[PDB]
Scaffold this active site. Structure first.
Site, mmCIF file in Angstrom:
data_model
loop_
_atom_site.group_PDB
_atom_site.id
_atom_site.type_symbol
_atom_site.label_atom_id
_atom_site.label_comp_id
_atom_site.label_asym_id
_atom_site.label_seq_id
_atom_site.Cartn_x
_atom_site.Cartn_y
_atom_site.Cartn_z
ATOM 1 N N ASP A 66 0.791 -1.220 0.000
ATOM 2 C CA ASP A 66 0.000 0.000 0.000
ATOM 3 C C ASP A 66 0.831 1.281 0.000
ATOM 4 O O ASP A 66 2.064 1.238 0.088
ATOM 5 C CB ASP A 66 -0.917 -0.048 1.224
ATOM 6 C CG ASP A 66 -0.305 -0.654 2.466
ATOM 7 O OD1 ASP A 66 0.921 -0.534 2.706
ATOM 8 O OD2 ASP A 66 -1.065 -1.266 3.240
ATOM 9 N N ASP B 110 -8.471 -6.674 14.011
ATOM 10 C CA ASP B 110 -9.734 -7.349 13.703
ATOM 11 C C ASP B 110 -9.561 -8.378 12.597
ATOM 12 O O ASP B 110 -10.555 -8.770 11.966
ATOM 13 C CB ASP B 110 -10.810 -6.333 13.303
ATOM 14 C CG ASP B 110 -10.381 -5.557 12.069
ATOM 15 O OD1 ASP B 110 -11.110 -4.632 11.648
ATOM 16 O OD2 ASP B 110 -9.309 -5.830 11.497
ATOM 17 N N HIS C 291 -8.141 -8.058 9.651
ATOM 18 C CA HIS C 291 -8.104 -7.568 8.257
ATOM 19 C C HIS C 291 -6.693 -7.552 7.687
ATOM 20 O O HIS C 291 -5.698 -7.614 8.416
ATOM 21 C CB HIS C 291 -8.687 -6.153 8.145
ATOM 22 C CG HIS C 291 -7.802 -5.042 8.624
ATOM 23 N ND1 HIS C 291 -7.863 -4.560 9.918
ATOM 24 C CD2 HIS C 291 -6.851 -4.285 8.002
ATOM 25 C CE1 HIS C 291 -7.003 -3.578 10.101
ATOM 26 N NE2 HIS C 291 -6.367 -3.395 8.949
ATOM 27 N N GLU D 146 -11.099 -4.013 4.289
ATOM 28 C CA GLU D 146 -11.895 -4.021 5.503
ATOM 29 C C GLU D 146 -12.400 -5.409 5.838
ATOM 30 O O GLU D 146 -12.350 -6.289 4.986
ATOM 31 C CB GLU D 146 -13.024 -2.998 5.316
ATOM 32 C CG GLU D 146 -12.610 -1.790 6.175
ATOM 33 C CD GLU D 146 -13.483 -0.573 5.973
ATOM 34 O OE1 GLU D 146 -14.373 -0.414 6.842
ATOM 35 O OE2 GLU D 146 -13.234 0.142 4.973
#
Lengths: 266, 266, 266, 266, 266, 266
Positions: F72, F141, F143, F148
């Site tokens: 990213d 979480d 991801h 997401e």
């Protein structure tokens, strides 16, 4: 509830025996106010009895005013059979300490009126008032003594038909002969155990890991009887390393930190 | 807790009725020491009442010194309406047995002071001391009588606003007219039920399967009220085959073996 | 158990304060029969104290015959330190209402004999008989006051070693200095709380959402102490919107309909 | 996925053998288009081999153009040892049917270059194109062949170090001597199995009940390898009664109704 | 996976219809490159068809180069029966838009060779290459079309024996006469659906709440077929408020924030 | 799936770096057949880059024919800003090894046509054929990268709106100023990651413990993206001690024994 996470069976017995000794010495028992101790049999409490005897011999504890109640006995087995629970208890503990015969209570598996025997046992406990400390083990399926899964939490001393798994797992004493293993046993009830002031369960072996998990991390449910100790005012699980297999790492870490000061020396 | 796994509703009623009869005959009730029986209404206990009546007629039981308490009644419905619980109970049971009027207790849904009515009912139970056996059914969501899910386990006799699902599922008696179905009912509380010495729940139909599962295999939780019977000293679930759909095969097999001797004859 | 689902903290405090007021006014306390109120400290009850004060000033309630017991106090902190719980309670509530000093009970964190202090506190509660309403909050992990997870449900008032998470989350008052935060605290026990006639827990913030879920939808288990309020005769959870994140939509909808009439006005 | 719920091992073998026969007869194999059959060893497929042989002898099936691949073989064991998988397969099946040697494929546990052996096996499968039907069993922990729990679902034929539980549970063949049991084995991979067109798993004994549950009712997860057959285009579980212990009653009832027409005759 | 949380069925149909329109208009279909649309019948897509028709009439979309495939049809019912799926589809959609007959594909429930019919349907889909968007609903138990729970995720178009629950829940169209309801149906398979480029499931009514939960929050498992859409490259659930009952509040809040910009206008 | 249970971050980086080195050296990359390496940024891979650099300097590996793709980049941040991912990657790795500029691929967060940038990135990966090893971390979480929860497992490189939790947890680099933190980022998709030949996830810190549990012991579900690595042909989790908090003790013990030979030296 306390969880005492130890490594070996020998450490578990030393811890449990030291706990018993400290309860007795703080209570300061007398002829008219005895310390009442509930006791189990089998391989699980062996290192505890060995350590209790040791402490007695070292002069750290006296059983002169200690009254005991055992959890169970085989039905129809002669008391002097070496595999009776009477015989186990004398050979592993009473033969080596200073407890008087009148202070020892064991179920009479040879009583002529079985229901009467069971009634009198409960009455004798109530004659003293209460068991101050009941030590026991736990079945692979979380059961207590000879009570079955989904037993009433108020059940009382009574006769039981042993399970195949139990005759099977005990046929070894009836020199590995699953045909002589008595068919029935007398056992205290779950209510009998829960009425004690403090309950200390010895947990040894990876075969007890699911039971340990049900006791400590699971929710309350009657199918795993040991889980209802979560509702008991004063319960302690004393366990070895292999028994901790089904716990979460953080659960074991939590209790290992909370009880750290208490598991030194043993 | 006991689970009596039977096949049909008729077998469930015979078993339950035989249980009631055996409790009454062993208790040996008298004018000054009556047997106190708690009772429900609806389709679920119908085969039990039919079998109780039968046993009475066969001379196996007398209700002369049996006192009864019913779980509930509609508010504002005339007692002689055929769909009142008063009317149900007489038509299905009291009309056929030898119980005296003074021994029958039903909530007065027409009382002028509702809270007072509910208070007196609890007081009347306490005047006798305790309910020896409370028979009931269970809602699809595990609730008891008209108590709601997450009711207090100590709740007491009180007025309730019926649920749409309940008016709906009862509009059939108000000849299938969900507008006449009374809006409110009087019901004993969960505490009222739990105070009984023994609780026997009739479980019929696959619509009760999740409740049966929550009672027997699930953990204790107030959202499924029936699960808290796991904590009751003496609880029995009597069920038919379709109600067992959500249980594990081994659970059903376990209870089928443990209770085998007890489900013969019925 | 009741769940009062509100939107904001201000609504939660108004609801709780109105509940307290209504219990006090219905009880009609006197010099010889006081209303006994258990109380917590911290950010969670702030809007409740603010609303209680308001109602007092509006003439809707008097604390003249209200006796209070606080949950806890720091050990070794001077009472007049502004961050003591003594100081919190006077500044946020007692400074503004008509309660007499002799009616206020707080743990003495400076007592010379700590175990004695804790014993006397329990004795003082018993001298009045019982706490009629105990208001508290809940930890992120479901714990109560300074009790830890897996505390005995019968535990009693006692000294505790604070957790890093707690010193950490409180160092801000010790002007954001996690080195001055007292190491120990006195706290009532879980048994102390459960002995109250009614327990009302304030639940604010999404950080309490897992605890709310464990209290309301989960099963009974000692690792989430708050879940054992399901077994309490009269428990109420009062919560704001962010705290409801882990509940099912139908659970929130159920309580929102059941309590609708009761959450108007506030 | 299909679940064929049968009562006994003999019925399971007849069903499985009839399935194999019907796939072979519908496929109509020839010299240039053989039916490719993957096969396991051990006690679990014994009644299937016995029934396949029977059908062959009754003239219902020919293995002349059937090519087979076995799941595994011991490393370093002489092929003619009676406990090699070579020896098992000839003694229980190939000795009694009309399959040509060139059609039989077994891993060479004595190959000099083990990784090469494993590579060639996969290449040989691909030379024919695909396995049309792979028959296997399942470990108590849901694993397949000698693959371990959390194996990659794309793993391939390779050498493995056997687990103590496996040497232990096989020492009986090495006449009950857990020291001779080879330390290593060659096994097809999970990917090897999943590449088959159809996978049929034989499930016998209550020791497989948790695995059956994980396969049929649980969710997909790599720790119970058998659960990933839920993602396979054409998977069948063939099971006996004791293996169904951990299933819900309604699950067993569902498949018993869906497959009723198919489990007649066998 | 996307979850579009809306309030009413009318909003769900507008959203779905707008999605369809936007996919068609961005694709720019022609005679030689049609947009291929898979479609369901029943009460669930009614507001979507109504909105699609509306948009067509408003000049926002043309179906001139749209090819459609329907999920299913009754076996042995005359096509012109008003309750055939042919009849449903014309009356609710094709009668009002500009799609040519040659572009409409429906299973022939009256075909003489049923397996052949089912084979040709799959072949016709493959002749165009792929379904670009398959719209469907979901059963209360998570199933798709007439596929059953635990269907293979690669299953294909085939004949099915309807379930009692389905005849029952459809007897109303066979003017409320559960004896005329055809016994069998033709249905696309789960593999047929999963091969589409995008799958959009309409979810209406609290009876779908457990299915919605299994699709969105549960894990992948073949017993709830809809859960395997988690593995699909491009799946969308479009739901109304009552269908969200079994979701956690935070789940609904998460998707309500993530899709906020997208649910305006509709 | 492999789990490499280590103690410290430094050990995790040495293990991961040694794994990378061994894959590169066994592959033997050339100008026309480069080794393709996918890479992440942030605090989690820091000890891995430090160890990779070390090994390079010790002459154990060359990056001359290694091609890299980063996960990213921030949108609208100048590449030479020291907090860009470009800047991170040069400062922590590329500045110290022998990789040519033409071999380095990073998303252009300043591209004029964002969707075009994202399309070209995917095209460039496909021009080489495949990523041989993709190294990444995991969100609290579960991801991956900036994808997401409930992302499609086939999602692709695309622009994302960062979450508050992410701006918040990154504002520190934008010298602790959560207003400058770019609003958007470019990120590879989950499909992009899953298309790699091997995926190695670095797991550090007790904040990742629930994610580790979901990856290793939980079932497959799209809400915890990391759980779908169970379906990947070749996935490895490399973790430190605090990250293992939510695993069962036996799970950690299993992998600690299975990988023992492999975690020496590092």
């Amino acid at each position: 509830m306390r969880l005492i996470p130890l490594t070996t069976a020998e450490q578990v017995g030393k811890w449990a025996a030291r706990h018993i000794v400290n309860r007795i010495n703080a209570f300061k028992p007398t002829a008219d106010r005895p310390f009442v101790l509930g006791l189990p049999t089998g391989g699980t409490p062996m290192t505890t009895y060995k350590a209790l005897v040791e402490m007695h011999k070292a002069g750290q504890v006296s059983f002169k005013h200690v009254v005991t109640f055992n959890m169970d006995e085989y039905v129809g087995l002669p008391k002097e059979h070496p595999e009776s629970y009477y015989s186990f208890m004398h050979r592993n503990f009473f033969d080596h300490v200073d407890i008087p015969a009148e202070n020892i209570n064991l179920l009479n598996g040879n009583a002529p009126d079985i229901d009467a025997e069971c009634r009198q046992y409960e009455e004798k406990i109530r004659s003293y008032g209460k068991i101050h400390l009941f030590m026991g083990g736990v079945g692979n399926d979380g059961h207590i003594a000879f009570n079955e899964p989904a037993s009433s939490l108020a059940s009382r001393t009574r006769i039981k038909t042993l399970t195949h798994d139990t005759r099977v797992a005990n046929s070894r004493f009836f020199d590995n002969d699953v045909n002589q293993v008595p068919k029935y046993a007398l056992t205290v009830g779950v209510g009998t155990l829960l009425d004690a002031e403090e309950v200390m369960i010895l947990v040894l072996g990876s075969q007890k890991a699911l039971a340990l998990q049900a006791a400590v991390e699971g929710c309350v449910n009657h199918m795993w009887t040991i889980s209802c100790l979560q509702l008991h005012p004063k319960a302690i699980m004393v366990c070895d390393e292999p028994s901790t297999m089904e716990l979460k790492v953080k659960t074991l870490r939590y209790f290992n930190e909370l009880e750290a000061e208490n598991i030194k020396g043993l």
